[PDB]
Amino acid sequence: QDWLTFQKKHITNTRDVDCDNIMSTNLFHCKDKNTFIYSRPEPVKAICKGIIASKNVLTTSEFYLSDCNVTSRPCKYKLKKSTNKFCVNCANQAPVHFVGVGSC
Numbered sequence: 512q513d514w515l516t517f518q519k520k521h522i523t524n525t526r527d528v529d530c531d532n533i534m535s536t537n538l539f540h541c542k543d544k545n546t547f548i549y550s551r552p553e554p555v556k557a558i559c560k561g562i563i564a565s566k567n568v569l570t571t572s573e574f575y576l577s578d579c580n581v582t583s584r585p586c587k588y589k590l591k592k593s594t595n596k597f598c599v600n601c602a603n604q605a606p607v608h609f610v611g612v613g614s615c
């Protein structure tokens with residue numbers, strides 16, 4: 512919805528995200544899935560430089576991604592680590608929503 516919330520929802524300072532902990536917090540509230548980008552925020556913000564009006568943008572190269580995917584046990588997850596391009600909604604020069612991995 513905005514850059515600060517995007518960072519909280521989608522940028523991790525560890526590849527080894529503790530999914531069962533973080534996904535249970537208010538921001539994620541035990542939802543099925545969330546993708547985190549294992550990176551410092553600066554190169555992530557740069558994806559959207561100069562983009563004013565809302566537009567989906569696929570990154571030009573790959574980043575390290577840590578996905579929390581729910582199992583069939585309520586609010587218990589498995590972590591998956593990978594690299595890929597990813598797509599974000601850019602608005603006012605910052606990522607404000609995570610769209611997808613590999614494609615918009």
Ligand SMILES: Nc1ncnc2c1ncn2[C@@H]1O[C@H](COP(=O)(O)O)[C@@H](O)[C@H]1O
Nearest residue numbers: 512517520544545546607608609610611
């Ligand atoms: N067009 C869409 N329809 C349904 N879900 C979407 C769409 N675009 C993005 N999402 C999902 O929204 C979630 C991320 O939203 P957010 O955490 O608010 O950035 C991800 O699970 C996305 O897969």
Ligand SMILES: Nc1ncnc2c1ncn2[C@@H]1O[C@H](COP(=O)(O)O)[C@@H](O)[C@H]1O
Nearest residue numbers: 512520538539540542543600608609610
């Ligand atoms: N472009 C989009 N179109 C429709 N729904 C979306 C889109 N982006 C995010 N969402 C919805 O917002 C949810 C995530 O928002 P939040 O719960 O605020 O993290 C996802 O499960 C999606 O259903």
Ligand SMILES: Nc1ncnc2c1ncn2[C@@H]1O[C@H](COP(=O)(O)O)[C@@H](O)[C@H]1O
Nearest residue numbers: 544567598599608609610611612614615
């Ligand atoms: N979870 C999601 N994340 C990102 N994009 C989505 C998601 N679910 C649906 N979409 C996109 O939203 C559009 C409509 O999806 P659908 O409801 O499957 O017809 C399509 O362009 C899908 O690729």
Ligand SMILES: Nc1ncnc2c1ncn2[C@@H]1O[C@H](COP(=O)(O)O)[C@@H](O)[C@H]1O
Nearest residue numbers: 544546597598609610611612613614615
């Ligand atoms: N970019 C996307 N990310 C996540 N889920 C998606 C995306 N595009 C479509 N979907 C959902 O994934 C499922 C695809 O169904 P199908 O096309 O029958 O394999 C539908 O529930 C779509 O809403």
